[PDB]
Amino acid sequence: AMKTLEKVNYKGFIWPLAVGIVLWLITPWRPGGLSVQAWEMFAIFVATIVGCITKPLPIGGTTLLGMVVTVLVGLAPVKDVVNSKGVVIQTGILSSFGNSAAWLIAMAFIMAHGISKTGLGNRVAYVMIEKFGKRSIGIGYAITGLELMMGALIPSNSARTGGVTWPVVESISKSYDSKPNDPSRKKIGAYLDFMAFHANILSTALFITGAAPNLVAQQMAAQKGYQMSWVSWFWAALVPVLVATVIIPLVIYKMYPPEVKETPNAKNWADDKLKEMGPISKPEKIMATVFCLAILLWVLSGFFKIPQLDSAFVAFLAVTLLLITGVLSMEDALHETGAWNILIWLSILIFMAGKLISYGFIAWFAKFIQSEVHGINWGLVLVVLILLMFYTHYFFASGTAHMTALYLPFLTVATAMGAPLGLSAMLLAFTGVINASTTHYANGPASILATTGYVKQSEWWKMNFILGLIYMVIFGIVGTIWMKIIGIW
Amino acid sequence: AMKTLEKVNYKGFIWPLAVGIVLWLITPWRPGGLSVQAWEMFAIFVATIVGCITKPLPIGGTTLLGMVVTVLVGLAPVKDVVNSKGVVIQTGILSSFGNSAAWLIAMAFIMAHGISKTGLGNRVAYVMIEKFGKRSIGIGYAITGLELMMGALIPSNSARTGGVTWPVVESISKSYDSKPNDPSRKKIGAYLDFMAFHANILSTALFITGAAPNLVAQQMAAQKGYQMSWVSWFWAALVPVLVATVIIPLVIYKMYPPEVKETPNAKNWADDKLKEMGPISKPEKIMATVFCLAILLWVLSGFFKIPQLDSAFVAFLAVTLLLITGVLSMEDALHETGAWNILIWLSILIFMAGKLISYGFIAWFAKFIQSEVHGINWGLVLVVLILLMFYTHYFFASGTAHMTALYLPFLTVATAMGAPLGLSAMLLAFTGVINASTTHYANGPASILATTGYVKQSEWWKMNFILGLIYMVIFGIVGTIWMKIIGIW
Ligand SMILES: CCCCCCCCCC
Ligand SMILES: CCCCCCCCCC
Ligand SMILES: CCCCCCCCCC
Ligand SMILES: CCCCCCCCCC
Ligand SMILES: CCCCCCCCCC
Ligand SMILES: CCCCCCCCCC
Ligand SMILES: CCCCCCCCCC
Ligand SMILES: CCCCCCCCCC
Ligand SMILES: CCCCCCCC
Ligand SMILES: CCCCCCCC
Ligand SMILES: CCCCCCCC
Ligand SMILES: CCCCCCCC
Ligand SMILES: CCCCCCCC
Ligand SMILES: CCCCCCCC
Ligand SMILES: CCCCCC
Ligand SMILES: CCCCCC
Ligand SMILES: CCCCCC
Ligand SMILES: CCCCCC
Ligand SMILES: CCCCCC
Ligand SMILES: CCCCCC
Ligand SMILES: CCCCCC
């Protein structure tokens, strides 16, 4: 018996629509050397992002709407178009949900549901509160150190986030009664969410085995005659990453403070709650075993490249084990909405960014940069290249496509303007790492920790912009001094 | 606070496991001319189906488990493997959820949720009960006639089912208080579910624009020198389809009777309920408009082949309209479990069948048939070919791959054993149509109407086997007499 329609934010359609429309009417006056379909896809993508901002039809709905409009105005098919030789010359909106990152994140949400159902997350939370609970910044630094230690083993940031630290964040927040999409999110949950994201950034920056784009940078620098190694990257990123570990958390605590700042009796409270939770149970032990097994497969995935260890099949396998074991039914995994919502909208955004890359937008931007800056001292050239490689990730959603597309061209321009090779390589790599401090779709950890409701998106974008300025200053200046020190030039 | 694990049917793992194991140990003694990977994939597929039967880890769980085992023993990657020329020589478990049929069915489940929420389904149900409510077989024949009329326009059976008649079935069942997965399913819901499936079969058989496999048969017969036309197919399938319309419902009513057989006062009851529902509302009017628009796009999709009318993008578009209009939020579409469950398990089954087709199983079966039957009167040859083209669809899940793979070879053998061309073509086409009376994954309508809980799977398979024998008798004998009558030979 439904009487009245649901409440929809129609005002939020103004800025997206308008933006799109204007760019569309601008199409004939496009920057030149560019294709009509490219500019149209750019306009639709920008309007979709402005919608994700103004939040009409929450991100799933507006992403579906942007995909629909993409298919209507003739920028994308529904089924992949083949060249009669098997090659897929055009992808479709259906060939977008077969993405590894989105399915990994969904299965990780499901594993997190299992951790929350068993009672393991809350036990871990009270343990961490007994250890470093008081002075919540202590909790933030502990999660930062945990992520840093895990960076050396787990080569997938999306896993390090949705499998280990996002559950810990959720549990610690639910022990403080910090629920999402509620004015009670500001207690401790939002601070911890943000700090988890930025600790994931730091860990990705410290170890070359912290993410894929770093490996892509390695392959490229080897293409141009510079061999990045686990020890060199580490010895170069140690100092700047320590400076960041010391600063970034402090400015987050000063800018986005944890409303609940002090817990003078965390020890007794955690002990009381644990003892009230009774001894550890069988489903909790099984979930712990499955979690340790998944972590083991993830850390082995760095030495053995094998389909059985794709870092997503591992999540499928853990979920399957939870199903055949009992701690997780199938209905428990079916109405875990976050999984399907993120599947939908992340897949759609990645598809639209891929269409931006294929239609010849990024390549034109790269040629423009290559033909614009001609005579300058290589210092300003490197500054400009870092700034561009930073603020171009607003038009990407993978982090690997960004590098494959813009790392070799910008590095080439730098080395051609007199800059040294190792410095430019490592700087553009650190920049491709800290790019994540731009958006809510920049990577897996952001697409996870921005949509949990603990942190709004306006605040997310603003604070990430500021912290990106800070990251660029830190890495550029400090790491340049550091690389001049240790024989990199 | 979870204490005890969930209840899992461990006994149901015996038959699948055993089966698999045995076939695996049989591998060295495989039929010959076959590949090891092919026989292993066959074993895993068969065990997965036996699991879907015995129901450990409901179909979603056992399909996930079969996919996991597929990836573990080295039969499928997780990411598509390319040949360095762009061609995809091996598909992955992730490149399986980008399927048009599964996403169409999911979006149709969502549209059905909208129809049930608005109050439109119940109004339609009481209308149909006022018209042909008494003598529930009247309801079955009305739904049959509706599906038959829609066959001439909507060229997608999955849509005709999940968009029009599955909602009507659900509403009429919920007006009789027939809920699924309940001993109250036998009242009227199961009979109507079965009858809807078989009416979809009949409509697919009557009009060549009733499904894709019929178009595939058309293309093939044109390849071999026989031009199927909308008027010829219809004039040949009229008589047998009338015989089926008269018989099949009767044997279903005699074999699977609708426990509630008589409703002597349907008129007054429907009028009372309608008047108690008040005049038609605004959300109902909007859902009706969206439904009519989707039906219009679906019927236009037969004359204009355009990505904007893919018969799945239309469901995406209807859902998007319901979102931007208000009658359907995003949370309403996120916890619609059936959509995601069918996505999962149908995609996985289609992927495994595609692996059966690529590894060289179906092609070997076809060569075996081509090299086995050599000297026979073409009548027994056609009998054997119809039987094989019928009972090979247990190893397929699309209905189009089946035809593309086995229609031209069997038709070739028939025409080479003396049989006439038009007769063999039309008979194998009708057989590719009635193949759907085999399984729960044979097509979209079956994968929909078998998993709704109104009809079990054991009963489904048994009754579909019997009705397939009956369909083969009817079509073969009657249609052969009919084609001999009208100048087809
Ligand atoms: C004609 C294209 C106008 C721009 C499309 C706006 C898309 C809205 C997505 C929320
Ligand atoms: C050109 C981008 C304009 C985006 C404006 C977003 C305003 C959001 C107000 C809450
Ligand atoms: C748990 C996945 C381990 C699978 C082992 C695969 C070994 C392949 C050797 C060829
Ligand atoms: C010496 C080249 C590196 C300088 C990078 C400075 C970036 C400034 C960010 C605001
Ligand atoms: C060694 C492979 C045996 C096949 C097992 C298949 C398991 C599927 C269970 C649903
Ligand atoms: C290939 C043999 C399949 C056996 C299936 C038996 C099902 C038993 C259900 C009670
Ligand atoms: C509802 C969308 C109908 C299709 C728009 C017109 C496309 C014409 C492309 C030539
Ligand atoms: C003349 C032969 C026509 C084919 C008859 C098919 C009968 C199938 C019997 C099950
Ligand atoms: C001529 C400069 C225009 C650049 C617009 C494209 C980058 C957003
Ligand atoms: C006012 C609702 C508009 C919906 C977006 C349409 C995009 C062309
Ligand atoms: C380049 C986009 C900027 C993000 C918002 C900045 C608000 C100060
Ligand atoms: C307790 C026996 C279940 C084993 C399941 C393994 C399926 C490959
Ligand atoms: C060699 C005899 C036939 C075996 C058939 C195996 C099942 C397709
Ligand atoms: C060749 C497969 C036949 C299976 C028939 C199943 C009847 C319940
Ligand atoms: C030009 C619009 C800025 C937002 C980028 C996604
Ligand atoms: C959140 C993962 C905790 C596992 C403890 C063994
Ligand atoms: C357990 C993974 C081992 C991989 C050996 C190739
Ligand atoms: C293959 C997983 C075995 C676990 C059964 C309890
Ligand atoms: C009853 C199991 C059927 C096996 C063929 C798929
Ligand atoms: C079930 C669809 C009903 C639409 C009536 C106009
Ligand atoms: C509410 C539907 C509007 C679509 C055309 C702008």
Residue numbers in the entry:
A (entry chain A), B (entry chain B): 0 to 488
What does the publication say?
The mammalian SLC13 proteins are members of the larger divalent-anion sodium symporter (DASS) family. Each protomer consists of a scaffold and a transport domain. Structural information, along with cross-linking and computer modeling, indicates that DASS proteins operate in an elevator-type transport mechanism (Reyes et al., 2009; Drew and Boudker, 2016; Garaeva and Slotboom, 2020).
Observing that the VcINDY structures were nearly identical in amphipol and nanodiscs, we surmised that amphipol was suitable for structure determination of another DASS protein, LaINDY. The LaINDY map obtained in this way was at 3.09 Å resolution, allowing for direct model building. In agreement with LaINDY’s apparent mass in detergent solution, the map shows a transporter dimer. The transmembrane topology and domain organization of LaINDY resemble that of VcINDY, with the scaffold domain being formed by transmembrane α-helices TMs 1–4 and 7–9, while the transport domain consists of TMs 5, 6, 10 and 11, as well as the helix hairpins HPin and HPout. While LaINDY’s topology is similar to that of VcINDY, the relative domain positions are different. The transport domain is oriented toward the extracellular side with its substrate binding site facing the periplasm, yielding a Co conformation. Compared with VcINDY, the transport domain in LaINDY is repositioned by 13.0 Å towards the periplasm with a 37.4° rotation. All three Co-S structures are not only similar to each other but, importantly, also to the LaINDY Co apo structure, with pairwise r.m.s.d.s of 0.41–0.52 Å, indicating that substrate binding introduces little conformational change.
